Design an enzyme around this catalytic site. Structure first.
Site, PDB file in Angstrom:
ATOM      1  N   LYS A  44      -0.956  -1.502   1.695  1.00 26.43           N
ATOM      2  CA  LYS A  44      -1.675  -2.248   2.728  1.00 26.43           C
ATOM      3  C   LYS A  44      -2.579  -1.408   3.616  1.00 26.43           C
ATOM      4  O   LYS A  44      -3.441  -1.945   4.316  1.00 26.43           O
ATOM      5  CB  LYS A  44      -0.699  -3.047   3.600  1.00 26.43           C
ATOM      6  CG  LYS A  44       0.045  -4.112   2.830  1.00 26.43           C
ATOM      7  CD  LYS A  44      -0.864  -4.785   1.808  1.00 26.43           C
ATOM      8  CE  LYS A  44      -0.662  -6.294   1.786  1.00 26.43           C
ATOM      9  NZ  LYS A  44       0.517  -6.683   0.982  1.00 26.43           N
ATOM     10  N   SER A 267       9.839  -3.961  -4.117  1.00 24.71           N
ATOM     11  CA  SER A 267       8.737  -4.455  -4.948  1.00 24.71           C
ATOM     12  C   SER A 267       8.339  -3.399  -5.985  1.00 24.71           C
ATOM     13  O   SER A 267       7.834  -3.735  -7.055  1.00 24.71           O
ATOM     14  CB  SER A 267       7.525  -4.851  -4.091  1.00 24.71           C
ATOM     15  OG  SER A 267       6.975  -3.750  -3.395  1.00 24.71           O
TER      16      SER A 267
HETATM   17  C1  LIG Z   1       1.119  -6.269  -0.353  1.00 18.47           C
HETATM   18  C2  LIG Z   1       2.407  -5.818  -1.090  1.00 18.47           C
HETATM   19  C3  LIG Z   1       2.585  -6.093  -2.480  1.00 18.47           C
HETATM   20  C4  LIG Z   1       1.605  -6.829  -3.399  1.00 18.47           C
HETATM   21  O1  LIG Z   1       0.254  -6.394  -3.415  1.00 18.47           O
HETATM   22  P1  LIG Z   1      -0.945  -7.406  -3.327  1.00 18.47           P
HETATM   23  O2  LIG Z   1      -2.117  -6.509  -3.392  1.00 18.47           O
HETATM   24  O3  LIG Z   1      -0.848  -8.090  -2.007  1.00 18.47           O
HETATM   25  O4  LIG Z   1      -0.888  -8.343  -4.447  1.00 18.47           O
HETATM   26  C5  LIG Z   1       3.784  -5.646  -3.048  1.00 18.47           C
HETATM   27  N1  LIG Z   1       4.770  -4.981  -2.361  1.00 18.47           N
HETATM   28  C6  LIG Z   1       4.597  -4.720  -1.018  1.00 18.47           C
HETATM   29  C7  LIG Z   1       5.742  -3.984  -0.311  1.00 18.47           C
HETATM   30  C8  LIG Z   1       3.421  -5.140  -0.408  1.00 18.47           C
HETATM   31  O5  LIG Z   1       3.287  -4.856   0.957  1.00 18.47           O
END
Ligand SMILES: *Cc1c(COP(=O)(O)O)cnc(C)c1O
Length: 320
Positions: A44, A267
């Protein structure tokens, strides 16, 4: 080498690293793109900067005049926060009061004007408050991570090129967990333009696999599985959607730390589990997959990611 003008110039150009012991059984090859190494530990940091920067260049905002606003309980708030602190922008962030104290401290440390909302109304309540503040604030400007084109655009201009160059153009598959979808859309489009045969694998939670016709639902893979298809997401670029469970992701996240020395968010565990599965398909022998590891694990010490190790830690006594 040179000295960066400010912290915003330290964004991007993150490294790639091969997964070794956790990728047992793969005939394919998996390299992780470490967004965990961004100045503020998450992918981000790229869009926090790009959304502000693009608005500036378009003359839509000005430091010390415009008031940035965004409803976000995740990494986007942090990405916006440190970039706003550096460029001199007042930043207002709304989030449910149910969010942990640590999530509020970090934003406060960057000087964010934090506004908590009814915990019973979830993000919907946070979004309403943000729009309410926007209407009030004269020079207010909402970023809208799920709608802002500057989100996938930065990935098309930096993330994608970095991956293409970092793999010497040998990448066969790009594995990306989908939150806003900006990463897979922007980077994926760029990669598709360098080699049309590159495959894009979107990853979502089995408990909220809406891209697969599933119904939205609660899950523990923080960062992905928004429960709806984001405006900035371009589903036409996706070659295959891979579903991973919350438990799979949590387990992989832990295995990544234990076996690779990579303390990552849940994630990242999801992306790794998805990529490892793909690399295990005989048809993909010899292929190089690149999985995005969105964030560093330290920001999630209070979440379910560390529940097991947490109780063990809390239950131990000193040895004389
Ligand atoms: C934003 C985010 C994602 C996914 O990425 P996108 O570009 O928004 O599709 C995955 N894991 C975390 C921890 C994130 O902050």
């Amino acid at each position: 080498s040179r000295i960066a003008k400010d912290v915003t110039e330290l964004i991007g150009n993150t490294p790639l690293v091969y997964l070794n012991n956790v990728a047992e059984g793969c005939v394919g090859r998996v390299a992780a793109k470490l967004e965990m190494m961004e100045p503020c530990s998450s992918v981000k940091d790229r869009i926090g900067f790009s959304m502000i920067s693009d608005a500036e260049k378009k003359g839509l905002i000005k430091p010390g005049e415009s008031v940035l606003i965004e409803p976000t309980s995740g990494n986007t708030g942090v990405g916006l926060a440190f970039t706003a602190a550096a460029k001199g922008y007042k930043l207002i962030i709304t989030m449910p009061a149910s969010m942990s104290t640590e999530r509020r401290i970090i934003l406060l440390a960057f000087g964010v004007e934090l506004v908590l909302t009814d915990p019973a109304k979830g993000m919907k309540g946070a979004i309403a408050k943000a729009e309410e503040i926007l209407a009030k604030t004269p020079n207010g400007y909402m970023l809208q991570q799920f709608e802002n084109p500057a989100n996938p655009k930065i990935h098309y201009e930096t993330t994608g090129p970095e991956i293409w160059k970092g793999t010497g153009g040998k990448i066969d598959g790009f594995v990306s967990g989908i939150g806003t979808g900006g990463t897979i859309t922007g980077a994926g489009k760029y990669l598709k333009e360098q080699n049309a045969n590159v495959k894009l694998y979107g990853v979502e939670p089995v408990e909220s696999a809406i891209l697969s016709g599933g119904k939205p639902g609660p899950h523990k893979i923080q960062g992905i599985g928004a429960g709806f298809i984001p405006s900035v997401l371009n589903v036409d670029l996706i070659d295959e959607v891979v579903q991973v469970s919350s438990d799979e992701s949590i387990d992989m996240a832990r295995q990544l730390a234990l076996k690779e020395g990579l303390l990552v968010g849940i994630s990242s565990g999801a992306a790794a589990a998805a990529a490892i599965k793909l690399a295990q398909r005989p048809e993909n022998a010899g292929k190089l997959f690149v999985a995005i590891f969105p964030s560093f694990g330290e920001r999630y010490l209070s979440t379910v990611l560390f529940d097991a190790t947490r109780k063990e830690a809390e239950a131990m006594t000193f040895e004389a």
